[PDB]
């Protein structure tokens, strides 16, 4: 009929008047042959494969106990609450503190993914998006700061490391010291570190108080399968009954329809696994509720019955303190976070330049203004309370549908503006819904393990120690250090002595 | 000179009179073109790459607490010793029991690797050797029986599972039900199960009471790096001082010269890593001694000062009890050990037949009499107290030097006879010397991970859950079950319903 004919000739005309206006001259839409309409399809598919890190990042930096401390705890029958009693849960005053910080990290992630993505398109003309990157969320929140105020480094110092690393990554890039520096790292340590982070981030998404709750303590094997139904109220311990938890099996169904959606190539599928096992866990009354009948849960439901809200940052705003940079374990956390960002935004940003055909004999057309926008956005992301940004590989779903200019990245920046207003629906995602989303990240990073040269022995001993010691010793710093230490001693003690025997 | 000329013409004549005697007619040395001398070189290189499993198997089945029970414990100030006080160490009576069982498992491994290897050559004419296979040592000793009498299944029942699995693997092979049965298992579950066993067997060789002592307990992260120097006398706990254990750093030096020996292609190298960090840990006086000044250690040194001994099996001889086969977790241990032997001796025994050129369009010349000798040897190995046998992949070092007949496997059977008489030197290998040997096994099994199809999603979700849940939940049964359960639900719920929609 002429109904679709009246629909098709308008899209032949709306794509002309955009290119005949001024906005086609800035983004250069005449060359880089494309139209206005197929840029909008390139940014819709980029956002849906990227919309999961708006909730994963909030539910993983609220476990850090961001600004809640011992002073704003509750009052009990004693004269004063002691040290470790408040920060392990079951409190009227501390749990209402941490419900006002997760509302300040959903807004602070959209405002960090706006500025990173909206400044990528306007300054570099490149079709990809930015957000706080996955992989360095778990290093700061679980290994530097730790689960609810553990560890040694406070959260105010951890947001000062991101500034001083962010300013160290502009002025190692503006001088030209990148190809001199990144090629110094060998291929096997660079490639096996991305596998071990994928196994650390999935062992996070299995524990009792972190994600679903499979693994647990044991007094002779040091880890065992619990999955227990009736557990301890105060702490997490198995009282009895294995594999019959209604919060465990509802999370497995979310893990299947995420994986049954990735095959058959549904673009956004990790967002539909989160929405399905959340929309069951909102009905009051069941055993899988996030809304119980406690006074600690009536305040979340009375905020849920309104579906939109304009919420402002008020707790985890600019909070920096350089008054702790004169001890030892601050700089070790500095040299680790400088290491994992140098290898994250180097192998990705050039690989996403050869898809779509930007590249010539080196030096694609947005080289110099993409290393700095990816670096300055960690500085503006550190004042707002979140971690470093990274150019996402999910942005490839927009490279395979015809996005080639910077109008892709501006529209991606405008869905994050249209998703900070839905704050009452995003703070209320349960921690067993975000569990399988931390496991499918580990599936997609282990897919690079078929490029490690397992033929030679020195390349396989170095790659095995780095992969193994990251999820076991519960440390990312103990896999980077114990990989370089094996790679030198197997190599320096015969080759370097042999070169120094012949160079003189 | 004529000195080597007088050496070379004798080896031209000694190789003739062996082939002109009757012993060249049985093994058929005229065809399969080879001589007597280069068979002896093929069996020397086969033994040295196989001599490590004479000490690893004894030091991993003595941690099981094989026949030592609560009745032959010591006597203390109380009227009777309680249950868990004896079996956790620090006892005059229980520790002298377990020093008489490790002397009955060094002899029982050589007598099991004799009969398996000496009957492979005489009945099948194939050049490889047999011993109790690595991979099923840790399943029985740490996961069925457990560390020193833990768990539910006693050791007398675990040696009855090996009989009833051994007799079930003759009469699934003699009827012809192997190609019908083994091809039913898909490729990804078959291939990823061999990677997760390699990561379970290496997490064993890092713990505080098992191997060296890196990982340890923690009350908030459930695993942490201890490596602590001054520990608890009774139990294992970190009192203070990280990374300064003299038993930790002596084990790292053994891990380097094992790995520095595998590259540059030294044939036996895992045996020279064990001998070097043992021969330092025999000098009385140091901090790394295996011979302290206790009465529990004077009895090991007074047995060490003699260097040869004829020792007889007296504790872990024929000990079978079918009086526990009417409960649940016995058969689950049966179907796991039947699973891992079906996939171990199928992908190996055909791969070791295409090297050396035995094969034609299927059906190499020792098909039917090698599935049964590999199966009947687990029956005769179960009466003597050790686990199932397997055709070793280290036997390939003899396939690449010209071994093609059964005289290779007979001579391998005669080095194990000449290494049961050195029992006082083999019981005295410390548990931190056997530690890195359990880690280089995990390096050599992870080298098959570059053949898993990480392209498709169903092949990568199934392979990731199987690899991850074996070293974490400390279970081999929880990786086989949780791999099939993901592989059906991603596949049966759309394909099988679609086939049943079209078949009718
Ligand atoms: N840190 C990161 N770098 C690149 N792509 C990512 N996708 C998710 N996290 C990422
Ligand atoms: N179980 C096993 N099967 C084959 N080769 C092996 N090498 C060591 N253990 C083995």
Curated annotation (Swiss-Prot), chains A, B:
Gene Ontology CC: membrane
First-listed, main subcellular location of the protein, grouped into a coarse class: membrane
One GO term of the biological process aspect: guanine transport
InterPro entries: Azg-like, NCS2
Localization in the cell: Membrane
Transmembrane segments: 42-62, 111-131, 157-177, 195-215, 243-263, 271-291, 330-350, 379-399, 406-426, 432-452, 459-479, 480-500
Disruption phenotype annotation: Resistance to 8-azaadenine and 8-azaguanine, and, to a lower extent, to 5-fluorouracil, but not to other toxic nucleobase analogs. Deficiency in the uptake of adenine and guanine.
Any GO molecular function: guanine nucleotide transmembrane transporter activity
Membrane topology (UniProt): Multi-pass membrane protein
Keywords associated with the record: Membrane, Transmembrane, Transmembrane helix, Transport
Cross-referenced PANTHER family: ADENINE_GUANINE PERMEASE AZG2 (PTHR43337:SF13), XANTHINE/URACIL PERMEASE C887.17-RELATED (PTHR43337)
Family: Belongs to the nucleobase:cation symporter-2 (NCS2) (TC 2.A.40) family. Azg-like subfamily.
Function per UniProt: Transports natural purines (adenine and guanine) as well as purine analogs. Confers sensitivity to 8-azaadenine and 8-azaguanine (8-azg).
Name the UniProt record assigns to this protein: Adenine/guanine permease AZG2
Native source organism of the sequence: Arabidopsis thaliana (Mouse-ear cress)
């Amino acid at each position: 009929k002429t109904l679709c004919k009246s629909w098709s000739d308008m899209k032949k005309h709306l794509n002309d008047t955009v290119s005949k206006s001024f906005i086609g001259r800035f983004f250069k839409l005449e060359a880089r042959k494309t139209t206005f309409t197929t840029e909008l399809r390139a940014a819709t598919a980029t956002f849906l494969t990227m919309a999961y890190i708006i909730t994963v990042n909030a539910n993983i930096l609220a476990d850090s106990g961001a600004t809640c401390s011992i002073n704003d705890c509750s009052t009990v029958a004693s004269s004063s609450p002691p040290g470790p009693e408040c920060v392990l849960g079951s409190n009227p005053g501390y749990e209402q503190c941490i419900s006002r910080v997760k509302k300040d990290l959903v807004v602070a992630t959209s405002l960090s993914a706006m500025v990173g993505s909206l400044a990528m398109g306007l300054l570099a003309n490149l079709p990809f998006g930015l957000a706080p990157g996955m992989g360095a969320n778990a290093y700061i929140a679980y290994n530097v700061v730790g689960f609810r105020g553990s560890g040694s480094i406070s959260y105010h110092t951890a947001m000062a490391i991101v500034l001083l690393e962010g300013c160290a990554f502009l002025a190692v890039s503006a001088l030209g010291l990148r190809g001199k520096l990144a090629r110094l790292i060998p291929q096997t340590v660079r490639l096996a570190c991305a596998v071990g982070i994928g196994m650390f981030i999935a062992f996070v998404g299995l524990q009792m108080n972190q994600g679903i709750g499979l693994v647990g303590p044991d007094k002779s094997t040091l880890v065992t399968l619990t999955a227990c139904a009736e557990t301890d109220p105060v702490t997490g311990a198995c009282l009895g009954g294995k594999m019959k938890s209604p919060t465990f099996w509802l999370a497995v169904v979310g893990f299947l329809i995420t994986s049954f959606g990735l095959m058959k190539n549904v673009k956004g599928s990790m967002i539909y696994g989160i929405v399905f096992v959340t929309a069951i866990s909102w009905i009051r009354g069941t055993q899988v509720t996030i809304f119980p009948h406690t006074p600690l849960g009536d305040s979340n439901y009375n905020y849920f019955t309104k579906i939109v809200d304009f919420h402002k940052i008020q707790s985890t705003l600019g909070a920096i303190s350089f008054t702790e940079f004169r001890k030892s374990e601050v700089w070790v956390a500095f040299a680790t976070l400088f290491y994992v960002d140098l290898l994250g935004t180097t192998g990705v940003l050039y690989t996403m330049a050869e898809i779509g055909g930007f590249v010539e004999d080196g030096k694609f057309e947005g080289e110099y203004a993409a290393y700095l926008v990816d670096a300055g956005s960690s500085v503006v992301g550190s004042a707002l309370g979140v971690t470093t940004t990274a150019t996402f590989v999910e942005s490839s779903a927009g490279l395979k549908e015809g996005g080639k200019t910077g109008l892709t990245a501006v529209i991606v920046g405008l869905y994050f503006l249209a998703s900070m207003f839905f704050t009452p629906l995003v703070t209320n995602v349960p921690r067993w819904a975000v569990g399988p989303s931390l496991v499918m990240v580990g599936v997609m990073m282990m897919g690079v393990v078929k490029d490690i040269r397992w033929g030679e022995t020195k390349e396989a001993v170095t790659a095995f120690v780095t992969i193994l010691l990251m999820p076991l010793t519960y440390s990312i710093a103990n896999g980077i250090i114990a990989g370089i230490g094996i790679y030198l001693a197997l190599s320096m003690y015969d080759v370097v002595l042999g070169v120094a025997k012949w160079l003189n």
